[PDB]
């Protein structure tokens, strides 16, 4: 190998450092939204029992 | 996948460990409150019979 190959190696590391990957904050948010579902279903259950 | 995905996986299980589920101690207290209803109706019945 020569100088150009080694410079391309450095450049590829630079490229990988700035790669555009999926936004995983959206996956975290979708995880956090499950509390709303659980607590709303608890509301539904408690309302039904109170009515009965 | 890459490192950030795997760290988000760890973060998501950390989130699920600290989710705010409904307070079910209230449901169990509502269960325990039925002694009072049953025994008070028993008082009512016994008082009526005694009066009669």
A39, closest residue in chain B (CA to CA): B22
Spatial CB neighbours of B4, under 8 Å, sequence gap ≥ 6 = A21, A24
C-alpha–C-alpha distance, residues A45 and A26, integer Å: 30
Per-residue tokens: A50 = 């109170």
Q: How many residues does chain B have?
A: 52
Calculate the alpha carbon distances from B36 to A49, B33, B40, B41, B45 in Å.
Answer: 18, 6, 6, 8, 14
For helices A25-32 and B3-17, the axis angle rounded to 10 degrees is 20
Helix, strand and coil percent figures for chain A, each rounded to 5: 80, 0, 20
C-alpha–C-alpha distance, residues A37 and B10, integer Å: 22
Technique that determined the structure: cryo-EM
Give yes or no for a contact between A38 and B21, defined as CB atoms under 8 angstroms apart.
yes
CA torsion B34→B37→B43→B49, rounded to 10°?
-110
Spatial CB neighbours of B27, under 8 Å, sequence gap ≥ 6 = A46
If residue A46 lies in a helix (H) or strand (E), which one and from where to where? helix A34-51
Beta-carbon neighbour count of residue B10 at 10 Å? Answer: 9
Q: What is the resolution of this structure in A?
A: 3.0
- B42 close to A (CB below 8 A): no
Mutate to test the interface with B, among A25, A31, A37 (most CBs of B within 10 A): A31
């Amino acid at each position: 190998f020569t100088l150009i190959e080694l410079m391309i190696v450095v450049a590829i590391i630079g490229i990988l450092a700035a790669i555009a990957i999926p936004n995983f904050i959206k996956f975290q948010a979708r995880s956090k939204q499950s509390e709303a579902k659980t607590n709303l279903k608890a509301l539904y259950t408690a309302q039904k029992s109170f009515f009965s």
